[PDB]
Amino acid sequence: QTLEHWLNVYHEGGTRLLRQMEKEAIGLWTYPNKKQYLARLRDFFEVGEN
DNA sequence: ATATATATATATATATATATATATATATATATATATATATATATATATATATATATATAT
Description:
The chain is mainly α. Helices cover 64% and strands 0% of the residues.
């Protein structure tokens, strides 16, 4: 997974294509809002939100 | 491994706003038609006078 690939997918289609890709590809996550993504970051790096 | 209670994401349903078309209520104007009024002419009926057809009364 790289930025170029994501941009290509987006140019091919909107949010729906990326949501489908989430299911298609392993080891990937997406979040439509920042709070959940930051929660994932926290639980990955084992730190408090501060 | 399933129930049972939160949390998040998504979709649905509703409310607001505006644009466009249609329906309803009201008023007015118009036209048409109906009905009536008016005027004129003619028809019918009755009345009166004269003419035609027929008979009788009065005066001498």
